[PDB]
Amino acid sequence: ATPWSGYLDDVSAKFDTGVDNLQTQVTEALDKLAAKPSDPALLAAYQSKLSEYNLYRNAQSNTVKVFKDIDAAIIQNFR
Amino acid sequence: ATPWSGYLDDVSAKFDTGVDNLQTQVTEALDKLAAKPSDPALLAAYQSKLSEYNLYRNAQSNTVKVFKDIDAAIIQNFR
Amino acid sequence: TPWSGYLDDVSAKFDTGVDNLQTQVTEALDKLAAKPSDPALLAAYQSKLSEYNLYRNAQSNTVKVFKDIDAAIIQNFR
Amino acid sequence: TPWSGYLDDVSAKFDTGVDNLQTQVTEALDKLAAKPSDPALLAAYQSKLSEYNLYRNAQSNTVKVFKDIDAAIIQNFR
Amino acid sequence: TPWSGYLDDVSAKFDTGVDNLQTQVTEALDKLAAKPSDPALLAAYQSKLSEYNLYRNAQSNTVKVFKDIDAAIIQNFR
Amino acid sequence: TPWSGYLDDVSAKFDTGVDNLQTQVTEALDKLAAKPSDPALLAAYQSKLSEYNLYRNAQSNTVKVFKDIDAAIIQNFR
Amino acid sequence: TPWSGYLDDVSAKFDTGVDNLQTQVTEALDKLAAKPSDPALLAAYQSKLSEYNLYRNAQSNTVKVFKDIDAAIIQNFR
Amino acid sequence: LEEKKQATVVSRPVLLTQENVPAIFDNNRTFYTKLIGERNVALEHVTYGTM
Amino acid sequence: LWIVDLNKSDLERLGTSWSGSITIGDKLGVSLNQSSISTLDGSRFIAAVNA
Amino acid sequence: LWIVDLNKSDLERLGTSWSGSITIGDKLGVSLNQSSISTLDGSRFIAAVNA
């Protein structure tokens, strides 16, 4: 029914549903700050938001790769 | 009713009943880490659990294949 | 039951070795946040954060090395 | 429970080396502030505060140097 | 009294070769864990962990090679 | 009764090379701490700290390079 | 003389090719350990050690390629 | 340095058999010694065996 | 066909465990029911209570 | 079938071992009972005791 999703899909999506709104908060803060680049209260906010977003996307991609290797090693042994 | 199990099934089951709880520990770790990815206390634990899981699955598969090939070689000589 | 592997038993060593650092860091930060301009407090926090950084690095590097030692042996069963 | 690392062991070496300066400066400050414009007070205060500055700088620079020696050695574990 | 094969002999030669390394690595890891940043402990541990990694690799590859030299002969009895 | 590999030997060469530097640094810091404001002490410590930092680096980089060679030779047995 | 195979001849061609590197690399270390902070010494050791690295890797890879040629021919006598 | 050593070991196996009936007896045992510095927990041992 | 299963169970745990350490003169260390080396500021005890 | 085992043992060790090496004036290195001289700079001998 819903677009077919496998195990890796269901792992990747776990992060997205974990960081409930970060994807929006980053663009929100980015626009507020671009409105007035020289404001320290905005800079101190956006530093934190962008750091969080970086760590999240990185750890997501590494975990998906490890779960690809674990499977390929098993499939190889069928033959 | 209950599954017939062969010999290879017994070998695999030794691993499954060896790691009593890892199968679920890994999932819980992931759930909380994904909830708050930027905590190094969560990260430091998840790294260990995921590595243990990788080794477990790998050893299990390699072992099964070896027994398969011993049996196959004995059976061939019946002819 | 708290089933732990070999890597788990390795990692746990550092957690028991740094007896209290985990709490100490949090407390030092908790107080410094209330009075950022006290140098007697800044000097304390610099040391605790350094200790924390080095501890987390050494721990994750050692776990990574033992993973490769194991995987190399497993590979040779075939 | 009062765990201390090697960087702590170094910082505290200064703090226990300059036996009293932290109190001496605090006293001289209040004396001077109570009756400013006294050459006898100003002369002393200058010296105490001046060397307190050096003490703090030397301590923090020493700790950073050590920290990066250790981080460089840890990087070679992999 | 128990039975030990040719491959067990080959493997055992390494264990009796590296007399104490198995204990050295354990105690060096506990001494490090007690003070995770001390240049002498880091410099000792990097050596012992490296020697351990090489020992386990050379042992397992050798046993693998001998297994294949035997299987290649047994195949010709047929 | 010790046991030492080849990387152990290589490492120990530097330790037996620099006869006393590890004590010299600790005593120079020891006296400096008593009088952080003295130029002759600062000038002596500035040198010793540097010699020590370079010593530890050259040690760890050499030990890594050797480990990387051996790991590449053993790979070719299989 | 002891029995030596074709792979031994091939191996030894390298050793006899690099007449003296085998020891130059050790003397360089013994000197550099005396004063680890002499750039004239460091600039020399970097070169010798790089040469040694390339020598050992070329050696092993060549040996393996000839092992796999012979094994492939021997397979077809059956 | 000067050093001296003396050692002595006596063993008896005892077996009951019938006439003309072949029999075997087989045994092995391990003996341990406590290494110094008990905080540095370790043991040494050896096995003696006879058939 | 009738199949019946019945089960009852009762459990209680209660009490304390003690351990700790003291340093005197920085020259003699004493410790109580500790399987590990101690940091020698001393005067440190724990009572683990379960009920 | 009755199976019985009995075992008794006594162990005792006492005395001291001496070893060490001293640098003398940048003139001579002297060492006692080191099997390959660690050749510590300055001086200190060590006596190791157990009982």
Swiss-Prot record, chains C, D, E, F, G:
Changing S47A has the effect of: Exhibits constitutive secretion of substrates. Retains the ability to display SipD/SctA at the tip of the needle filament
Q: What is the effect of changing L7A?
A: Can only secrete early substrates such as InvJ/ScpT, PrgJ/SctI and PrgI/SctF. Can polymerize into filaments in vitro, but not in vivo. Cannot enter cultured epithelial cells
User: Known consequence of changing Q75K?
Assistant: Shows a specific deficiency in the secretion of the translocase SipB/SctE. Retains the ability to assemble needle complexes, but is not able to invade cultured epithelial cells
The listed outcome for D68N is:
Cannot secrete the translocases SipB/SctE and SipC/SctB. Shows increased secretion of SptP. Retains the ability to assemble needle complexes, but is not able to invade cultured epithelial cells
Q: What induces it?
A: Negatively regulated by PhoP-PhoQ.
Q: Name one GO biological process term.
A: protein secretion by the type III secretion system
Q: Chief subcellular site?
A: secreted
Q: What is the effect of changing N61A?
A: Exhibits constitutive secretion of substrates. Retains the ability to display SipD/SctA at the tip of the needle filament
Mutation: W3A; reported impact is: Abrogates host cell invasion and effector secretion. Can secrete effector proteins
Protein name stated in the entry = SPI-1 type 3 secretion system needle filament protein
What this chain does, per the entry, is described as: Component of the type III secretion system (T3SS), also called injectisome, which is used to inject bacterial effector proteins into eukaryotic host cells. PrgI/SctF1 forms the external needle filament that protrudes from the bacterial surface. Is probably involved in the transduction of an activating signal, thought to be mediated by the distal tip of the needle filament, to the secretion machine. Required for invasion of epithelial cells. Required for the secretion of the effector protein SptP. During infection, can induce innate immune responses. The needle proteins interact with host TLR2 or TLR4, and induce signaling by NF-kappa-B and/or AP-1. This activation is MyD88 dependent and results in increased expression of cytokines, including TNF-alpha, IL-6 and IL-8.
Q: Where in the cell is it found?
A: Secreted; Cell surface
> What is known to happen upon mutating Y6A?
Decreases invasiveness. Abrogates host cell invasion and effector secretion
The observed outcome of changing D68L is: Shows a specific deficiency in the secretion of the translocase SipB/SctE. Retains the ability to assemble needle complexes, but is not able to invade cultured epithelial cells
Changing R56L has the effect of: Non-invasive phenotype
How its function is modulated: the record gives: Binding of bile salts, including deoxycholate, to the PrgI:SipD interface may inhibit the T3SS function.
Gene3D superfamilies in alphabetical order:
1.20.58.90
Per the UniProt entry, the effect of R78E is: Cannot secrete the translocase SipB/SctE and SptP. Retains the ability to assemble needle complexes, but is not able to invade cultured epithelial cells
- List the keywords (alphabetical): Protein transport, Secreted, Transport, Virulence
**Gene Ontology terms, MF aspect:** identical protein binding
Effect the entry attributes to changing F77A: Abrogates host cell invasion and effector secretion
Swiss-Prot record, chain H:
Q: What superkingdom heads the lineage?
A: Bacteria
What is its subcellular localisation? Cell outer membrane
Disruption outcome:
Insertion mutants are hypoinvasive in the HEp-2 cell assay.
Q: How does it assemble?
A: The core secretion machinery of the T3SS is composed of approximately 20 different proteins, including cytoplasmic components, a base, an export apparatus and a needle. This subunit is part of the base, which anchors the injectisome in the bacterial cell envelope. Forms a stable homooligomeric complex. The complex is composed of 15 subunits.
Q: Which family does it belong to?
A: Belongs to the bacterial secretin family. T3SS SctC subfamily.
Q: What does this protein do?
A: Component of the type III secretion system (T3SS), also called injectisome, which is used to inject bacterial effector proteins into eukaryotic host cells. Forms a ring-shaped multimeric structure with an apparent central pore in the outer membrane.
Protein name (record)? SPI-1 type 3 secretion system secretin
Task: Name the source organism.
Answer: Salmonella typhimurium (strain LT2 / SGSC1412 / ATCC 700720)
Residue range from the parent sequence: 359 to 409 of 562
